Each structure stands twice: as C-alpha cells, then as structure tokens.
A paper describes a structure:
pmcHuman galectins (GAL) are oligomeric β-galactosidase-binding lectins assembled from small (∼15 kDa) protomeric carbohydrate recognition domains (CRD). In this work, we studied the impact of homodimer interface mutations on the induction of Jurkat T cell apoptosis, allowing us to positively and negatively modulate the biological activity of GAL-7 by designing a covalent disulfide bridge (G16C) and destabilizing mutation (G16S) to control homodimer strength, stability, and biological activity.
Cα B′-factors between apo and holo WT structures show that chain B is less flexible, while chain A is more flexible in the presence of lactose.
Author numbering:
A (entry chain B), B (entry chain A): 2 to 135
Write the structure that this text describes.
C-alpha cells in the first residue's frame, strides 16, 4: 500500500486533529502512525501509534536519540483484518487523545515538547482512504 | 427532531473536539450548535453556529448579556437538504475550527474565555445520529 508522509512546517499546536480513514488488509500484521521531529531515518518520535493485528495489541511510545521509551498499551484491539476504521489523533496541552470508532481509546501524555513535531507518517499494512490534518 | 443538550461542568480546553453526525431534513430551514456558559436558554454563548438552508448562509456569533456580537459567515453552505453531514468543532487557544466534510470551513476567534463554557446544545431542523465530546 502507498504510505502517507507529509510535512508540518509550522508544527502542530493544542487543538490539532489528525483524521485517518482506511482499511486493515485481510493479511495485515501491523501498521503505524508516527509524529516525527525530523526527516532523517531514526528521527525522534513524539508519538508512535502501532496497531498490531499479529500480536493483538496497540502500542504507544516515543523515541529519543534512537531509543524507545516506556510502552503504553491501549485496552483491547479496536481493529480487524478486512475491516474499515477511522482514527482521530487529537493534540492537547497535556498529550495525544486517540479515538477509534466512536470512543476515546487511550490518552498518551507528551514526553517530547509538541513544538518539536514537524512531520507525520502513516505506513505499514494499511490501505488509506484519507489522511487529513485540521 | 430530538435535540442534544449536555453539560460540560469541568469546562473545555484546547484539544476539545465536538463531533456531530446527522442528516439535514429535506424540508429543513435552520439548525444550530451552541456552546453556552450557563443552563438557561438566554445564557451567554461562546459559540453559536447556525447553518441556514432557507437563506443559504452559515452564521457564526457569540452572545453576552443578551446582545449578539459581530456576525461571521463561512464561504458557501456545505450542507444540503436531505444529505448527511459530519461536523467537527475543534477548540484551540485562539478559537474554534469548524470542519465540515473533508475541509476546514471557518475559524472563529474566541470572544468569551474557554473556561466559561459549560453546556453544549444541538437542535433545530436536524436529525442527529451521533454527538460526541472528545
Ligand atoms: O516491548 C516489547 C514488545 O514485545 C515489543 O513492543 C517491542 O517492539 C518494538 O516496539 C517499538 C515501540 O515500543 C516499535 O513498535 C518497534 O517497531 C518494535 O519492534 C520490543 O522491541 C520487543 O519485541
Ligand atoms: O441578516 C442578517 C441578520 O443579522 C440576522 O442574521 C440576525 O439573525 C439572528 O442572528 C443571530 C446570530 O447573529 C442568531 O442566529 C439569531 O437566532 C438570529 O435571529 C437578526 O435578524 C438580527 O440580529
């Protein structure tokens, strides 16, 4: 599938909503949504949101200087192979709210300053219908 | 039609998202989304968002101590009688972003402080499928 990768040169601020609509392929392993602080491979990640169909979990984390932080896991897995989905990633002063379907799923407190984010990437085993930043 | 009215006793903040899904009746005239600062119908309004199918405009305004402020109008009318719609009202530190469909429609600067909001009303000529505060 074609991934999404787009620059946020003015950054994101509290009140930013990333809306992602798509379908999990029937043979999917994992896909990811990253909010990154640079363009180079290995750049710091303010948020890594990683639905894992192969291991029935959704992992949240950050990355600084090449190292992963403490993993946070949401409750259950609100994604199914072969099914469409809608995700909101909502930025506040305190963190990122992940909404899947009709309910908040998990809240990830900021570890890196939000002002460091300047790129969004959506990739892995996912068919994207739309990616929008409001 | 059945309206929505729910309390926000803790107020709202940058990163609050109101997601409204519904259908505009085929003979609709107007409907509204209000963020109010009290429990009475005449309570101050931090946001009054008023799609008007009868006069082909969408009006934004605030109300304080019984008086309306300066009206703001969006570009065109992204609603149609008989059609379903999705609206996001997204709060930032600077204002409310109104998203309709796949695009930001208008940005309305705060006239009232966010901390004063404590009620959300959705009513008028509209059929509501979902009202959520994220
Ligand atoms: O934590 C242990 C779990 O068993 C597993 O989550 C971890 O995997 C990485 O997790 C990263 C996010 O913390 C990121 O997703 C990366 O891509 C993954 O390889 C570990 O490295 C070990 O397997
Ligand atoms: O032609 C534009 C007019 O300015 C018209 O829009 C005004 O309508 C009110 O507008 C309010 C929001 O400003 C709110 O919607 C109220 O319910 C409406 O009666 C009123 O006739 C005069 O103030």
């Amino acid at each position: 599938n074609v991934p999404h990768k787009s620059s946020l040169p003015e950054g994101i601020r509290p009140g930013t909503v990333l809306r992602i609509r798509g379908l999990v392929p029937p043979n999917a392993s994992r896909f990811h949504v990253n909010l990154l602080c640079g363009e180079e491979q290995g750049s710091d990640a303010a948020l890594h949101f990683n639905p894992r169909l192969d291991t029935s979990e959704v992992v949240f984390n950050s990355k600084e200087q090449g190292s992963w932080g403490r993993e946070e896991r949401g409750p259950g897995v609100p994604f199914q192979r072969g099914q469409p989905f809608e995700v909101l990633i909502i930025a506040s002063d305190d963190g990122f709210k992940a909404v899947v379907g009709d309910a908040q799923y998990h809240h990830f407190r900021h570890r890196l300053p939000l002002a460091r984010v300047r790129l969004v990437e959506v990739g892995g085993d996912v068919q994207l219908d739309s990616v929008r930043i409001f």
